[PDB]
Design a binder for this molecule. Sequence first.
Ligand SMILES: CO/N=C(\C(=O)N[C@@H]1C(=O)N2C(C(=O)O)=C(CSc3nc(=O)c(=O)[nH]n3C)CS[C@H]12)c1csc(N)n1
Length: 265
Amino acid sequence: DLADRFAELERRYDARLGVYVPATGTTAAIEYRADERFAFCSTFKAPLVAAVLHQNPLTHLDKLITYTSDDIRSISPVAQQHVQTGMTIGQLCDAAIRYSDGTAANLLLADLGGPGGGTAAFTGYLRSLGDTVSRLDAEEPELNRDPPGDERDTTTPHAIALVLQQLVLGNALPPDKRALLTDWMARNTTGAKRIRAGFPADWKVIDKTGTGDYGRANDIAVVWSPTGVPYVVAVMSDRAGGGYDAEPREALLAEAATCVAGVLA
Ligand SMILES: CO/N=C(\C(=O)N[C@@H]1C(=O)N2C(C(=O)O)=C(CSc3nc(=O)c(=O)[nH]n3C)CS[C@H]12)c1csc(N)n1
């Protein structure tokens, strides 16, 4: 009744919903529209922090990068207050995952690929994870604004769930660098009402969200059962037929996570 239960979700919230859960030795693949393209939005900041972590020693995380107030072109609740102090890369990483800071991600993009090669550098990182589907093409804020059906700035639930499976659970990042990434997303302040609300409290959830135009609302997550058996949930949604200013529904992401928790009992 999987596809039956998610289709109702789509009818009730008037939304396109994408769901992927990788197969495990015990559980099978939960896949609803898993190979359709959904806009990254702020979800890209999580594998982007991984990219900066992978390309640099830990001594790089304490490098002072200096920006201006003119450089805050988007929702940057952490970078807003450090207009003069600059920010250590480890803090921009912190701002990128936990507070979805846009100016952080734009400075993190430049540290990775330079002034004009940041998007392509980030896309090539995902290539190195075997993700040949996703693409970042724009920087903040325009990556949240691409029209529907456009392939630019898009991933799929399948590809981002497989990517995230290598970062937290796989051997893509070294033990210590992975630890800092697993901690950052477990400290995130944005995903309370998405996948967190649908998994029981004695389950452990780590997540990075994305929200954007055309009603776009995403939550990428790794979940941990009370027995410690781990899963990676990718939930992606938009309400294109609503228009650019359509209202994202967080409770949509919540219910989809409730359904996947029900089959993971
Ligand atoms: C051009 O950029 N447009 C954006 C945008 O910057 N999106 C980013 C993104 O993915 N972000 C995320 C997040 O990570 O989910 C968030 C966090 S979600 C959230 N938390 C709150 O406490 C709250 O009161 N409201 N919201 C929405 C906000 S926008 C930023 C946008 C936001 S809503 C919309 N229609 N567009």
